[PDB]
């Protein structure tokens, strides 16, 4: 087995939001079978960011989702080769983001390569004015489709003046080799920003993430 | 107590799907504080239906959602006056449905009046070809907004040739009198068709529905 | 040919916007082959309306669209039997409307029966606060699909304090019996509110609508 | 004065579609005040492309749009500094694309830098199976919003076996310096693939694009 009880990872993101180009690099670690992982990020180019860090936080590790024995762990089974993941984030005020990523395993460490493009965010909106205060804990709905695994989430960012800023996530997970696909299931996640410097150029995150069947089944 | 341990309801739906006009009348019952109810429906006009019954099933009782003590039960608190609910159902193949309903209390019995309009369903699609096999259990994401309660769900209809037919639900719950609104929370639901006649003109449904905080909190 | 150079019509709408029920009845007339028609409406029940009239204005006659000889006039050809039309109106601030209609012909007079359900409009939004000042002239993109005619438009309502309120229209035109379908084409339209009383309970409208190929063809 | 009657351009694209990375370089020319331009493209990395070329064709020069004297030419006025343009392409089968671009003027030649991310395209769909055969001529609806110029289009890809594959374009044009914005208007366009080799690694395109008021005004 190539996936140990403790695994480290390296991540690199090249992105663009409302015309602003940036590059982020980071290191992370966690326990794949327990559903715990952490990551320390640094904005290497284009810093400081003129937008909310929160839109970038869920783009930095679903191989770390704790899966019970009866639910095929598609993402873990895809290794050593790995998987690719794609995403559409539809924000309630017109903002749209598409993400494309490659997950590989090189010398016992997971390697993540992310590309991000965020467009149509209002200048006076919560993203461009940094009015967000982290994500609420979420629940993803997953199912097999077109030979790959897909998942959707109704997420929300908490606001400074109170209230929520709603975002719909549509994710696609694609294995680099044909492996076992699960049926209809759910993934609960809670991402927290554990520490950050004043301008968000150095950020530390934590994520608890577990897969399960619906409670009524 | 205005809402008793055991409550009955009467429901009437006037609808249109792909130009086909129909009317449905029903009678139901259940336990509001336990999170479960049943309903028997009869197609009084426009029978037999040339589309999947399943798209109509979740339009026939959220006052029956079991809520913990720490989550304000907005829908129960709205009574004797009651509440109105509205909904948008966005199907993956282009089909769209808007629903509008009024919930009142007349002489110890809940009265539900539903109006349904379903449009843009492909003639060769699972709705018009009756290829659906019930809903999978679901999880609604709720939050307060614009002085009322809103909730969204990523639902799915099971297909007989295998696979899923995806539908996004967007619901709005509006009290007739200003009552206490809850915060961010979730409602798990599971609707089953318990019995039906050959042409789906007489149908019986069961729904278990419970409110809760996200499992990681 | 059952459709003459001058044709009259009568229309009735039963609708609901944000829980508010209403009924509208009207009489109209126009010239089918010239591309223009007029209509006088009166709110028979639910008057005065607490929302903007403008959202109802495009639901009151596409058989009146002028078509050149080289573009099959599907809607005119559908008569004496007639056609049914359905619509989805997606507003930028979340408001969603579905409309279903039946168009028939009785002794030289077209009979229109409309059902309208409008949901999710913000209470402080331009619809519920009556801040709209009529529609801008529009351009519909049409094409045949699933044995019927479809069309989409990027429309906009002019705002009182300046700016626009965007709405995407998705319409489906369905002949009761199969008749010749056109290919890809466009329809230019301009609807005007010619007169109205103070509370919009009596309203007169004018529409100019003509079909054409794209100008670069 | 800076934009001459005849202007040349260089374009570079770094993109990803369904996990497949590619790079495209090209050179074009045309007449800005007349509303027409040409471009020759070469796939420099990731060739041959396993998807339809057509989705990339409209990403390679709106400074070339012929504008009448009464409609402020925002994009031409933005020069020598230039503009940035962003886009969302919503395909009817779930595919989503976000594009971000930078347009500048260097040594009397326009320089275009494009980043493209395409996600959620079905493996058996029109894009991944190359079932498309060019775009139909289109009509963009433009308006000023949030201090910038926005435009939406209901586009369509012609299918090899007949019918259309629908795509909704949402574009945002942002000048690098505060310049005069137009009002509500339209842009007609027709993009043709004039020449290509067997695997689409070398492609030549032509575009005729002109701005105008609605025909009824």
Swiss-Prot record, chains A, B, C, D:
Biotechnology and industry use: Fluorescent proteins have become a useful and ubiquitous tool for making chimeric proteins, where they function as a fluorescent protein tag. Typically they tolerate N- and C-terminal fusion to a broad variety of proteins. They have been expressed in most known cell types and are used as a noninvasive fluorescent marker in living cells and organisms. They enable a wide range of applications where they have functioned as a cell lineage tracer, reporter of gene expression, or as a measure of protein-protein interactions.
BP-aspect Gene Ontology terms: bioluminescence; generation of precursor metabolites and energy
Domain of life: Eukaryota
Post-translational modification, as annotated: Contains a chromophore consisting of modified amino acid residues. The chromophore is formed by autocatalytic backbone condensation between Xaa-N and Gly-(N+2), oxidation of Tyr-(N+1) to didehydrotyrosine, and formation of a double bond to the alpha-amino nitrogen of residue Xaa-N. Maturation of the chromophore requires nothing other than molecular oxygen.
Gene3D superfamilies assigned: 3.30.1300.40, Green fluorescent protein (2.40.155.10)
Keyword tags: Chromophore, Luminescence, Photoprotein
Keyword presence, Transmembrane: no
Matching InterPro entries: GFP (IPR009017), GFP-related (IPR011584), Green_fluorescent_prot (IPR000786)
Recorded family membership: Belongs to the GFP family.
Record-given protein name: Red fluorescent protein drFP583
Organism of provenance: Discosoma sp. (Sea anemone)
């Amino acid at each position: 087995n190539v996936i140990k009880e403790f695994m480290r990872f390296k991540v690199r993101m090249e992105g663009t939001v409302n015309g602003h180009e940036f590059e982020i690099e980071g290191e992370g670690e966690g326990r794949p079978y327990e559903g715990h992982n952490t990551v320390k990020l640094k904005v290497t180019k284009g810093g400081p960011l003129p937008f909310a860090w929160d839109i970038l936080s869920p783009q930095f590790s679903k191989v770390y989702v704790k899966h019970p024995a009866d639910i095929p762990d598609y993402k873990k089974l895809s290794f050593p080769e790995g998987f690719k993941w794609e995403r559409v984030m539809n924000f309630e005020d017109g903002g749209v983001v598409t993400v494309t990523q490659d997950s590989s395993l090189q010398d016992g460490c997971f390697i993540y390569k992310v590309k991000f493009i965020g467009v149509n965010f209002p200048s006076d909106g919560p993203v461009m004015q940094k009015k967000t205060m982290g994500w609420e804990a979420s629940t993803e709905r997953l199912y097999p489709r077109d030979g790959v695994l897909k998942g959707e989430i109704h997420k929300a960012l908490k606001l400074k003046d109170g209230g929520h800023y709603l975002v719909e996530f549509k994710s696609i997970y694609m294995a680099k080799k044909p492996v076992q696909l699960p049926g209809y299931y759910y993934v609960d996640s809670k991402l927290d920003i554990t520490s950050h410097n004043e301008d968000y150029t150095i950020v530390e995150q934590y994520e608890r993430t577990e897969g399960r069947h619906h409670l009524f089944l």
